[PDB]
Amino acid sequence: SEQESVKEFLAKAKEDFLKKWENPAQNTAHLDQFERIKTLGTGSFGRVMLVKHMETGNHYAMKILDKQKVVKLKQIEHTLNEKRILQAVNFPFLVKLEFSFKDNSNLYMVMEYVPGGEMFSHLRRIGRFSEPHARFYAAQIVLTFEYLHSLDLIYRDLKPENLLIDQQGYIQVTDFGFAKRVKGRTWTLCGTPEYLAPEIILSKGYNKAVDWWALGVLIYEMAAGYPPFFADQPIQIYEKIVSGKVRFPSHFSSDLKDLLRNLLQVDLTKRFGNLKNGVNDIKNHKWFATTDWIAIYQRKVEAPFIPKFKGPGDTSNFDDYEEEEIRVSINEKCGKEFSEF
Numbered sequence: 284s285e286q287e288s289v290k291e292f293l294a295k296a297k298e299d300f301l302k303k304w305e306n307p308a309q310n311t312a313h314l315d316q317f318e319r320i321k322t323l324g325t326g327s328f329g330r331v332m333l334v335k336h337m338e339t340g341n342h343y344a345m346k347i348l349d350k351q352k353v354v355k356l357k358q359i360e361h362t363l364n365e366k367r368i369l370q371a372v373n374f375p376f377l378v379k380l381e382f383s384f385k386d387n388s389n390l391y392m393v394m395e396y397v398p399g400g401e402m403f404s405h406l407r408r409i410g411r412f413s414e415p416h417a418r419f420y421a422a423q424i425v426l427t428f429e430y431l432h433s434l435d436l437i438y439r440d441l442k443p444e445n446l447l448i449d450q451q452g453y454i455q456v457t458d459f460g461f462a463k464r465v466k467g468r469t470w471t472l473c474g475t476p477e478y479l480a481p482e483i484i485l486s487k488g489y490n491k492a493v494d495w496w497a498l499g500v501l502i503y504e505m506a507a508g509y510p511p512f513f514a515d516q517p518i519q520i521y522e523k524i525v526s527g528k529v530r531f532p533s534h535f536s537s538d539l540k541d542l543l544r545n546l547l548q549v550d551l552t553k554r555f556g557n558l559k560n561g562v563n564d565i566k567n568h569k570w571f572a573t574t575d576w577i578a579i580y581q582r583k584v585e586a587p588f589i590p591k592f593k594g595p596g597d598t599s600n601f602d603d604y605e606e607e608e609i610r611v612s613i614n615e616k617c618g619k620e621f622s623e624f
């Protein structure tokens with residue numbers, strides 16, 4: 284029976300997560316064990332680098348976060364959530380946190396390296412994803428949220444930049460810096476302007492339904508090639524989101540539009556994923572009728588785009604960024620803040 288099988292899978296996943304959540308993993312490694320190769324991404328309090336583990340020769344993506352910038356930007360709790368969630372979760376479309384540690388200047392989160400690059404680059408390069416192509420990716424995010432939401436985890440940062448393509452052409456979700464365990468409501472104003480549900484913008488306490496709104500935004504952006512509420516300044520992006528007036532390209536199928544109308548629903552009593560039938564309102568929608576949910580999960584489905592790779596530590600699928608030095612101070616910084624890391 285396919286129904287019992289989902290619940291038994293979800294029960295077990297919860298058990299595994301909760302064990303790992305109560306008995307973690309910490310001081311797994313040291314910086315000196317890694318050779319820095321190349322910057323894969325930049326940010327306001329950190330960067331992500333390709334490193335090689337010298338004992339094994341294996342490559343990893345090492346997220347490096349400046350402790351003082353984390354404190355200033357009010358991301359201590361968020362940074363601690365990220366490591367704690369990432370060590371505890373296990374799902375095919377989530378990046379794998381292999382090592383974590385800290386020194387006097389920084390926090391280190393060492394993930395398995397996903398060499399296919401961001402979905403962002405691929406999407407900007409080709410214009411838009413045709414509907415079957417978008418649907419393949421959207422099916423993976425749907426399963427991913429069902430898994431996280433079952434564990435009471437809200438993701439809160441969905442966007443093409445956080446969706447990395449692996450060698451098989453499947454997605455790995457990276458960046459859990461806004462992810463949070465919440466059984467009911469939460470109140471932090473965070474996310475990416477284009478992807479924010481109206482309820483976040485309006486300073487209302489909100490739930491996991493913001494993830495399903497952002498799924499709507501992602502799906503529109505994959506199939507159109509640009510997001511449904513765009514402006515040059517965030518302030519006008521917010522105004523657009525809150526009315527919820529969305530226009531669809533003439534090439535969008537009726538099924539797609541009907542789906543996106545139900546995700547991009549300003550009214551919480553009406554937004555798919557938030558109704559009584561949960562995630563099944565999305566999985567059983569007509570736009571997904573050709574989707575074999577199990578085969579996606581098992582990665583049996585042939586991906587419509589497989590990345591090019593020249594062996595371990597190839598970075599041809601990533602853009603180039605200015606290389607800066609990793610400084611490690613002689614004096615411990617922000618020790619009490621990060622004593623739990």
Ligand SMILES: N=C(N)NCCC[C@@H](NC(=O)[C@@H](CCCNC(=N)N)NC(=O)CCCCCNC(=O)[C@H]1O[C@@H](n2cnc3c(N)ncnc32)[C@H](O)[C@@H]1O)C(N)=O
Nearest residue numbers: 324326327328329330331344394395396397444457474475
């Ligand atoms: N040019 C700049 N300096 N600014 C660009 C900002 C980029 C980014 N980060 C930040 O500013 C702030 C967060 C505040 C913004 N709010 C949101 N979270 N939406 N974050 C920070 O400062 C933390 C450092 C960067 C982490 C995110 N990047 C990433 O995570 C990228 O690194 C690669 N990457 C990550 N994991 C992997 C992996 N496992 N394998 C391969 N590549 C990876 C992949 O290219 C991702 O797009 C953001 N806006 O989300």
Ligand SMILES: N=C(N)NCCC[C@@H](NC(=O)[C@@H](CCCNC(=N)N)NC(=O)CCCCCNC(=O)[C@H]1O[C@@H](n2cnc3c(N)ncnc32)[C@H](O)[C@@H]1O)C(N)=O
Nearest residue numbers: 406407408409410411412413414416506507508509510532
């Ligand atoms: N069939 C496929 N699977 N793919 C092929 C589709 C190619 C097709 N274009 C489109 O479908 C899409 C692809 C959108 C994403 N564009 C890029 N990534 N560069 N384009 C279209 O259908 C026309 C754009 C209408 C959007 C409104 N914006 C605008 O009026 C201006 O902003 C820029 N613009 C819009 N969106 C984007 C974006 N996502 N990135 C960069 N620039 C953009 C653009 O140059 C305009 O002058 C086309 N023939 O141009």
